[PDB]
Structures are given as C-alpha cells and as structure tokens.
Design a protein around this ligand. Sequence first.
Ligand code: CA
Ligand code: CA
Length: 147
Amino acid sequence: SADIDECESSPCINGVCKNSPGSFICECSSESTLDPTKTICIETIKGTCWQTVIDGRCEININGATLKSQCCSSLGAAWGSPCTLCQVDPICGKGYSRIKGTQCEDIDECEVFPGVCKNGLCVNTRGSFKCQCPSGMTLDATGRICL
Ligand SMILES: [Ca+2]
Ligand SMILES: [Ca+2]
C-alpha cells in the first residue's frame, strides 16, 4: 500500500500543500486564511508589489497595496516585506489568478500597476494588457513607452 501524494495536483490555491497519511493539508502564510473547504488561502492582507529583485533585496515598489496573488501572477518579481519571490499560479500561469478548482480569472494589470504605461493609457486585456498611445504616437520595443 502507498499513500497518495495529493500535492502533485497543486490542490492548495494560494497556499502550500503538505502531504499526510490519507489526506493532505493546505497551509496559508500570514497574509491569508483558509476557506471552509481548507484548500484555498483567501487573501486578507495587502502588501507591496516589487518590480525587481536585486542581490538579497526587492526594489521598485509599483503598488504598495496589492493582493499577493494578483502581483505574483502578473507583473511582480516579489511581494511583501520581507519579500518573497513571485511564482505564477502553476495551473493558470501568467496574467491570470486561480479562483477555485482549475478556474482562472484575468488579472487587471492596470490596477496592479497604476502607471505601468509611462506616457499612455493602460488598457486591460484578458491575459495581458496594453498601452494605448496618444494620437500619432507609437510604442517602443518594451510596449510601455509611447513615442
Ligand atoms: Ca496523502
Ligand atoms: Ca489582464
């Protein structure tokens, strides 16, 4: 006989899975709390979304008040203080956050990072976003600057 390792299926939404005999356990960090089913960490505390990681620290606060799942599944390199490195949802991937089951929902990057478009209008799209330039202007290579 062997125990099933349920953690292989990434059952713990926004949490860490710990296998156990006959079951599994989801653990939440201090910015979240378990739902009734004990498989989803519901975000309770916002924190800083960092655009970069350098040496042993995180830099460039792009928004001081983001949901970790929103930050980390889109434009953030890291989140919080002290910070931890962002990983996209293993099921939904970049641009989306996992809500329940394998259900993914679009992240609005224009809300995660107000000002992501340096001199244009941020326009959210499903799975990404784009910068809309003033009339007569076009985007640079990075897509964030209008010229
Ligand atoms: Ca198990
Ligand atoms: Ca989006």
